[model samples]
Target: NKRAPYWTNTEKMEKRLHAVPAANTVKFRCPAGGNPMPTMRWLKNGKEFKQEHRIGGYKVRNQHWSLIMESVVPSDKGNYTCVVENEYGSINHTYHLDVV
Candidate 1:
């Protein structure tokens, strides 16, 4: 029997910039839907995140390649991006976090 390959569908990749928490904890949920597996990364102002900024104040989870940001902070208030890639191509979604 001939097995069909995964069909491509319109996928959505988005994120939300949560307000900085008083207790130093925030959460951002990545948009859902994509073929293959997308990638998740966090940036500060435009630079890659380091171990120091990701120890306890930050966290990322890969749910079918979806992105999630947890334990956010004031420094986390910046341009957050969620990038989704497949054999076809890739796309990126940006989120801005504001401290309130």
Candidate 2:
């Protein structure tokens, strides 16, 4: 069986912007679904980001296709983009974080 990887809630998404404050936690989630379970590829300010699921502090919630950060900081503010992909197809979106 084969199917294109897609968002469980949306087949495609529009570019989005979200703003948050410091000392707070944030989640980066691009929900995806498919026969094989899609994966999320995230980046911060054009740089290759990381998965902290096992690293703590800034852990990724892979089980739900989301990544969360603990204790927002001034330096933590930036543009975030995540791509959901599988062998069949892929989708992408962006979030602009304005720390206040």
Q: Cα deviation in Å at residue 8, candidate 1?
A: 12
RMSD of 1: 5.3
Question: For residues 1-100, could you state the per-residue lDDT of candidate 2 as single tens digits?
Answer: 8788777654234536657877778787777777677777788887777654223346667877776787777777788888878888887777788778
lDDT, candidate 1, 1-100, per-residue tens = 2222231332333234445654444454454444445455655556775557644544566654333445554555677665555555556556677766
Runs off by more than 4 Å, candidate 2 = 10-15, 51-57
Best by lDDT: 2
Models 1 onward score TM values of: 0.57, 0.79
After TM-score superposition, what is the CA distance of residue 11 in candidate 2 from its true location, in Å? 12
What is the lDDT of every predicted structure here?
A: 0.51, 0.72
Displacement of residue 64 (Cα, Å) in model 1 is 6.5
Worst window of 10 by summed lDDT in candidate 1: 1-10
Q: Model 2, 37: alpha-carbon shift in Å?
A: 1.8
